[PDB]
Amino acid sequence: QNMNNAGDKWSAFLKEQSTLAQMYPLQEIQNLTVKLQLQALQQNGSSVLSEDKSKRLNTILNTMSTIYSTGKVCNPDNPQECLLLEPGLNEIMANSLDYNERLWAWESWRSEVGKQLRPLYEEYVVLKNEMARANHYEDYGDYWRGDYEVNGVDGYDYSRGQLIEDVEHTFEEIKPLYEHLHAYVRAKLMNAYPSYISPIGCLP
């Protein structure tokens, strides 16, 4: 807190000085040495929010992390032979190279975690959204991209709704590199695993 609440003695002092810095635009300043300064100005934490129910959400957040870290599947051939995700389940994908047991290990692992964390998810979306709306943004996934909201050198900017459009200008030409690779592994998956794979269609 000596960095958050003693940041808040400066964050409350920021709301005297940041507003006295908040009369300057983002594009008619080119100094740079002071342009990004007001872009790092909403930083010091979310002191514009009255955080009382974002400090309710951390009670949910520790429950989300505990079940994933304790993600485990007890095997049914003998019920108290159990394997966690990290030393028991990725090893099955590593050591075992069978179709059907890895097919079981794929399905039995996914029948554990996301169902228990689905009621930890719907309220997690919406409460982060008014957290984002009190952070004066449309969604917290936009804030995720808010570090990429650098509008500084008139051509050097990077809108939030354009940074992925150029990414879909990439992989559709890498998609034929997958297409040979798809047919490459479909030439492999017929004699590596017992012939379930359509050599025309998609992958399991």
């Binding site: 990004l36 300064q37 007001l38 790092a40 100005l41 930083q43 010091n44 570090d147 990429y148 650098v150």
Partner: protein, 67 residues
């Protein structure tokens, strides 16, 4: 703090680096005597050399660009 060879002694734990401003760049490491600190050593020394640019430069002038 560097001390955690195998002990349960009360200290927080990660190999982490800092730019404090005002000419101060700290490390914090949780040394279970292992190679992951030297994995981060030049990894931070590539990144704290960006931080040596904002040695005395403000909180409003933070890390480099993106993550």
């Amino acid at each position: 703090m560097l001390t955690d060879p195998g002990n349960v002694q009360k200290a927080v734990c990660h190999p982490t680096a800092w730019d404090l401003g005002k000419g101060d760049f700290r490390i914090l490491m949780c040394t279970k005597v292992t190679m992951d600190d030297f994995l981060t050593a030049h990894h931070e020394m590539g990144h704290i050399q960006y931080d040596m640019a904002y040695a005395a430069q403000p909180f409003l002038l933070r890390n480099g660009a993106n993550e």
